[PDB]
Amino acid sequence: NLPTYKLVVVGDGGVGKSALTIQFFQKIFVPDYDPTIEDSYLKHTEIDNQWAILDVLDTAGEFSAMREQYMRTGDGFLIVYSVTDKASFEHVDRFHQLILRVKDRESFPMILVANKVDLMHLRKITREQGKEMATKHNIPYIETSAKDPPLNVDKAFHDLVRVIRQQ
Numbered sequence: 001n002l003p004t005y006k007l008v009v010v011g012d013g014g015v016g017k018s019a020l021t022i023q024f025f026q027k028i029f030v031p032d033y034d035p036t037i038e039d040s041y042l043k044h045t046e047i048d049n050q051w052a053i054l055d056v057l058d059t060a061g062e063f064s065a066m067r068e069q070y071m072r073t074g075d076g077f078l079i080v081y082s083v084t085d086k087a088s089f090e091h092v093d094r095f096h097q098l099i100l101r102v103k104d105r106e107s108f109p110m111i112l113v114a115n116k117v118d119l120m121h122l123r124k125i126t127r128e129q130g131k132e133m134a135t136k137h138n139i140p141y142i143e144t145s146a147k148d149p150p151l152n153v154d155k156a157f158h159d160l161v162r163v164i165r166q167q
Ligand SMILES: Nc1nc2c(ncn2[C@@H]2O[C@H](COP(=O)(O)OP(=O)(O)O)[C@@H](O)[C@H]2O)c(=O)[nH]1
Pocket: 011, 012, 013, 014, 015, 016, 017, 018, 019, 020, 030, 031, 032, 033, 034, 035, 115, 116, 117, 118, 119, 144, 145, 146, 147
């Protein structure tokens, strides 16, 4: 019987949650994916030569029953922001407190994902900024890009699973 890791992809709208999720599950880049669907994805994944089932909810939207459950029984979270969106970085703390509130814990597995690093000519959030925010929350930091050709999409999800397994 394989373990099932339930993960939640959270972040402001337009940071690339859907694109990163589609790139991880379907291995294609879908630009301008409709911003409103909040769906979940399920597939068998091999991480560190150990197979597992990944139940990932791509968040969107007020209140949602599906979002509510996945936040409660989730095992790990992906706090995603866009390096071109300063407000998406400003809400990293807000998303950090919501997870710790929903889970009612002082620390829970999460990784800080800085998306859209392919747009270097439009980058507003720096690597030192993301590293400092990650160091403050004591969580891993990684830079991703869902646009073709992708960068670190699998590693972002795999590193969260590694954090879950190490606890
Ligand atoms: N350049 C670049 N654009 C991206 C990337 N990820 C998403 N986008 C674009 O950003 C827009 C919003 O992305 P989306 O996946 O809908 O973000 P979401 O609303 O949080 O799910 C889309 O038009 C995408 O084409 C990326 O890694 N690089």
